[PDB]
């Protein structure tokens with residue numbers, strides 16, 4: 056039970072019913088829980104580039120030594136503040152890559168730089184830092200693995216649904232839409248483009264998988280369907296909000312992160328980072344958004360770190 | 367009008383007021399303890 | 408209600424002793440709980 | 448009021464309490480075994 | 489007698505009830521002896 | 531108060547007033563506890579004096 | 587006030603008026619508290635004198 | 643401080659129904675309070691104190 | 700330590716209504732306990748002991 | 758109390774027995790189900806051994 | 814150990830209702846047990862023993 | 870007598886790195902940082918100290934941009950000054 060009045064926002068034209076409601080007190084506590092860590096003081100951007108001072112810099116080549124050191128301090132607070140520099144570094148040998156966390160972190164740098172430079176259709180000018188996902192934890196709190204669901208006897212094939220699962224916001228819809236849609240790239244559209252039957256082979260069961268994914272997307276951003284759709288015509292882009300366009304690119308962004316950045320790290324990640332199917336903990340909308348329509352309520356962290364952008 | 371004689375209403379009132387005051391007393395003790403432990407204003 | 412005045416005296420006597428007895432157990436249980444896992 | 452005479456209420460109470468103590472006695476023993484096997488506090 | 493049994497009838501039924509209950513409990517104990525030997529759970 | 535306040539029981543039924551008080555008080559007490567637990571004053575999940583699940 | 591104002595109870599039922607006032611006041615009291623709790627005057631979630639969830 | 647004639651409460655309220663209401667209310671309350679406590683940090687069953695018994699396997 | 704007059708329980712409770720209830724409860728409890736055990740590591744049907752009979756055919 | 762036996766002059770002995778029996782069975786089922794939902798679970802704890810492992 | 818007066822149970826429980834309930838319980842229990850076993854590794858219908866009969 | 874931009878004990882980076890401005894009140898022994906015996910590791914001989922920032926015992930550090938450390942301090946990121 057909650058108490059009135061809720062916070063409200065009008066999304067669509069008056070009377071169409073596209074409106075958002077939220078709890079004011081939960082918003083205030085969420086805002087408290089999504090504070091951005093204050094950016095480090097600016098460093099001197101002069102002197103030799105990191106490419107010519109250090110021994111094994113493969114990504115951050117063009118940073119000055121000051122900007123490079125500043126970046127290492129920042130990522131330590133964002134990822135491994137309790138452990139410190141040596142979470143990713145062999146003691147007494149900064150150049151060595153002979154610890155799995157450094158190999159992973161190097162690709163994470165490329166992940167973030169690709170996000171900040173190439174996916175502005177999604178992350179705009181706000182961008183992402185290590186903090187967006189890690190939040191001061193080496194292992195992101197909201198990573199996911201393929202969910203096997205409840206146990207069945209050996210003579211009954213699991214249905215993948217009809218179970219109370221948080222992943223689809225506690226509906227009984229197919230409870231793992233992440234693997235088929237945010238890892239693999241199965242088709243999400245099911246609505247026909249013609250009034251009369253004859254040219255739409257999509258199925259009712261595909262509708263349920265898509266519906267399950269949309270619960271997860273909505274739940275991951277803390278919004279209702281009307282944040283992106285006019286639900287009298289879910290398929291109709293002309294009646295949707297610009298957030299739907301953003302969400303479209305974000306789905307493809309998430310696919311790129313898991314297939315090209317996370318999955319190739321599976322063999323070097325320890326078994327503790329893997330699910331029952333051997334797959335690595337990886338990325339969904341929840342991993343960055345964490346139940347907010349914008350990660351950290353849109354806090355601009357990446358802009359204060361030039362090393363978080365490509366070339 | 368309620369069935370109660372004027373003396374019964376006198377006796378019920380005496381017992382009602384003494385009991386309500388004692389309950390209010392328990393309420394005050396509990397709110398003092400709560401204020402000592404967790405002042406809310 | 409039907410009870411006579413003496414029947415009210417008798418029931419009230421047993422009720423109050425019983426309730427105080429129940430309340431005494433509640434106090435002991437809360438003492439055990441405070442000693443084991445203080446909550447304030 | 449229930450139909451039992453005073454002596455009947457006395458006889459029923461003696462057996463009821465004796466039986467309930469036997470049941471409560473068994474409960475303590477089971478709890479003792481449970482605590483020896485898997486202490487929970 | 490609220491059920492309608494006489495005092496001797498209530499005594500005869502009790503005797504047969506307790507014996508049958510114990511025989512059932514005997515079976516339950518024998519079954520659990522086999523299960524502990526086959527598949528101890530504690 | 532007034533010397534003749536007792537006459538209130540010539541107008542209002544004593545029994546119905548009592549039961550209504552008992553019903554109102556139990557409901558209000560359940561309601562107020564729920565209201566307080568939903569605020570910053572929550573005394574159960576404040577990890578005071580300690581968090582007992584971090585002890586495990 | 588008029589001297590013969592007491593004649594109001596010759597035309598209005600004393601028991602219903604007493605009950606009507608009691609019901610109105612309890613409802614109004616709950617309504618005003620919920621209203622005040624929905625404004626800047628809210629004294630429960632104002633972290634005053636202190637935030638108790640912040641103590642750990 | 644109680645009153646001397648408080649016993650007359652049973653001339654107004656049925657003692658049997660009060661008893662059954664008290665017994666019913668107290669059982670409900672005890673079930674409710676335990677489940678409330680089990681839903682907070684104070685939970686004494688899943689706290690792995692003194693030990694986690696699932697970790698033994 | 701039972702009471703000598705415990706047989707008098709059948710002066711208060713109907714023996715017939717009691718017997719049917721015990722049978723129904725015991726049947727249901729038996730069904731219930733079997734299912735709980737099957738849901739755990741103790742499962743004696745899907746444990747492939749002595750052998751797995753589906754492997755024999757696939 | 759010495760006169761506690763009179764409780765059977767007030768409350769029907771036959772329904773109280775049935776209510777006690779009914780309440781105790783449900784409570785016993787409830788408490789087992791609660792304990793089996795926690796770390797104290799003794800059935801799926803692989804103690805003394807995991808029997809599903811024995812079959813792999 | 815059985816009692817010599819066990820036949821007197823038919824003075825207590827109606828023979829007709831007992832017989833009907835037994836065959837109803839046994840039929841339902843037998844359906845249930847066959848269901849459980851089919852849903853496990855013990856399945857004797859889909860085990861392809863002695864052969865698989867689904868030809869290409 | 871510390872300057873205004875000195876690294877202070879409440880600085881988050883100082884906490885994560887276990888910095889102290891007096892290396893004898895530091896956790897240099899526990900970390901056993903390689904390159905020298907932990908009883909000789911302080912700021913003056915660390916690769917990350919910028920001799921061209923600050924003045925006196927209060928020099929610059931790379932890890933603490935815009936701030937100054939003390940040459941007699943230590944933190945858990947200690948690395949021999951090879952250059």
Ligand code: BCL
Pocket residue numbers: 389392393394396397400404552555556557558559560563566573660662663664666667675
């Ligand atoms: C900082 C917050 C404080 C706190 C602040 C306060 C304050 C302040 C007060 C209370 C009060 C109470 N609190 Mg609190 N409370 C805290 C934590 C707790 C916890 C807990 C799990 O942590 C519990 C269980 C309680 C419990 C209690 C009660 C003992 C009491 C309210 C009784 C009531 O509503 O009376 C209802 C009133 C009656 C008169 C009931 C009469 C009984 C009748 C005879 C019942 C018969 C049964 C009935 C007829 C059944 C209906 C019939 C159905 C058909 C079955 N507190 C914390 C520590 N609490 C109040 C109190 O102590 O009052 C003295 C109070 O003023």
Ligand code: BCL
Pocket residue numbers: 430433434437438440441444446447668669671672673675676679684
């Ligand atoms: C870890 C301990 C848990 C908790 C676990 C349980 C569980 C579990 C149950 C109860 C039950 C009850 N608890 Mg408790 N209870 C807690 C805290 C409280 C507080 C409080 C001020 O914090 C209060 C007033 C209560 C009150 C109550 C009653 C409503 C109820 C007993 C029946 C009854 O009606 O008696 C009212 C008659 C009285 C005389 C009031 C009793 C007052 C008790 C002794 C508490 C006040 C003192 C309290 C311990 C103060 C702290 C100590 C000092 C700091 C040293 N609980 C904390 C959060 N409580 C039981 C129940 O429902 O029984 C039916 C039950 O099963």
Ligand code: BCL
Pocket residue numbers: 429432433434436437440444664665668669671672673676679684686788
């Ligand atoms: C931190 C949490 C604490 C804890 C804190 C408390 C506190 C605090 C209280 C209880 C109380 C009770 N708890 Mg608890 N409880 C814990 C864990 C458990 C577990 C469990 C599976 O872990 C169980 C099954 C119980 C069970 C019980 C009951 C025996 C009792 C509630 C009776 C009631 O509602 O009467 C309502 C019924 C009536 C009023 C009817 C009339 C009287 C009846 C006939 C009384 C019969 C005797 C009674 C059951 C005897 C037991 C008292 C013992 C001292 C425990 N506790 C843990 C260890 N528990 C309460 C208690 O002891 O009350 C005295 C109480 O105040």
Ligand code: BCL
Pocket residue numbers: 512515516517519520523527721722725726727728729730733736741743846
């Ligand atoms: C790993 C766990 C074990 C196991 C552990 C146990 C244990 C432990 C017990 C049982 C008991 C029973 N098990 Mg089992 N059980 C296993 C596998 C099975 C399988 C199966 C398909 O695999 C089946 C169908 C059964 C079936 C049964 C019933 C015959 C019996 C409970 C009946 C009841 O509730 O009566 C309730 C009905 C009444 C009380 C009414 C009165 C009884 C009437 C007069 C008699 C009916 C026939 C009687 C039950 C015969 C029992 C004979 C043998 C001891 C089996 N078991 C596995 C291998 N099973 C119980 C038992 O033997 O009880 C004695 C018991 O305690």
Ligand code: BCL
Pocket residue numbers: 470473474477478481485732778781782784785786789799
């Ligand atoms: C730590 C976890 C422990 C454990 C801890 C406890 C504890 C602690 C207790 C129980 C109790 C019970 N447990 Mg357990 N229990 C465990 C595992 C099991 C398993 C299982 C499949 O693993 C089962 C089926 C049971 C079953 C039961 C019942 C025998 C009993 C509840 C009866 C009841 O509610 O009566 C309610 C019905 C009535 C009161 C009706 C009136 C009397 C009736 C007609 C006669 C009943 C006979 C009675 C059951 C005889 C048995 C006593 C023995 C000492 C066990 N336990 C594990 C190993 N269990 C309780 C108990 O022993 O009670 C004495 C109890 O307090």
Ligand code: HEM
Pocket residue numbers: 108109110111112113114115116127128130131134135139140141142143144149150151156157158160161164932946
């Ligand atoms: C802690 C604040 C910290 C310091 C100091 C630090 C230093 C450091 C250096 C000097 C290098 C370059 C070494 C060389 O000569 O090649 C370097 C490189 C990387 N580091 Fe780092 N580092 C610190 C902390 C961390 C932490 C906590 C991580 C992991 C999250 C991390 C990761 C990396 C990565 C990756 C590189 C390689 C970068 C590249 O461009 O290839 N560092 N670090």
Ligand code: HEM
Pocket residue numbers: 130134143156157159160163164166167183184185186187188189193194195198312317324328335336337338342343
């Ligand atoms: C930012 C540049 C950044 C760094 C640095 C970083 C580091 C890092 C490490 C060291 C790991 C391995 C942790 C471990 O011990 O297993 C790791 C793993 C994951 N990360 Fe990461 N990470 C950075 C950025 C980001 C961002 C922006 C996201 C979210 C999109 C993200 C997510 C993940 C995931 C998923 C993992 C795998 C699970 C795991 O091994 O812990 N990272 N990261």
Ligand code: HEM
Pocket residue numbers: 243244245246247265266269270272273276278279280281282283284289290291298299300301302303304306
């Ligand atoms: C709310 C829970 C919700 C529902 C329901 C919903 C439905 C839905 C459907 C049926 C489709 C398929 C449309 C078609 O067949 O062409 C669909 C597609 C997209 N949605 Fe959606 N949707 C809901 C919520 C949200 C929210 C909150 C967003 C925006 C963040 C969003 C976005 C999208 C996007 C993008 C698509 C197109 C995906 C693709 O074609 O690859 N949805 N939705």
Ligand code: HEM
Pocket residue numbers: 170177178179180181182183187237272276298299301302305306309338339340341342343344348349350353
């Ligand atoms: C998951 C597939 C996913 C969806 C869906 C999604 C949607 C989304 C929207 C609609 C916005 C715009 C919100 C608005 O109010 O305009 C948005 C914004 C950001 N996102 Fe996102 N997003 C998904 C996943 C992820 C992941 C995994 C990350 C982190 C790597 C991420 C990041 C961001 C950031 C940053 C923004 C803010 C951009 C801005 O306009 O300010 N998203 N996302």
Ligand code: SF4
Pocket residue numbers: 888911912913915916917918930931932938942943944945946947948
């Ligand atoms: S990095 Fe080196 S010079 Fe800088 S504060 Fe730490 S120990 Fe001193």
Ligand SMILES: [Ca+2]
Pocket residue numbers: 446447573574575576577578579
């Ligand atoms: Ca507390």
Ligand SMILES: [Ca+2]
Pocket residue numbers: 406407629630631632633634635
């Ligand atoms: Ca306040």
Ligand SMILES: [Ca+2]
Pocket residue numbers: 487488686687688689690691692
């Ligand atoms: Ca515990």
Ligand SMILES: [Ca+2]
Pocket residue numbers: 743744745746747748749
């Ligand atoms: Ca087997």
Ligand SMILES: [Ca+2]
Pocket residue numbers: 529530799800801802803804805
């Ligand atoms: Ca076990």
Ligand SMILES: [Ca+2]
Pocket residue numbers: 856857858859860861862863
């Ligand atoms: Ca076969």
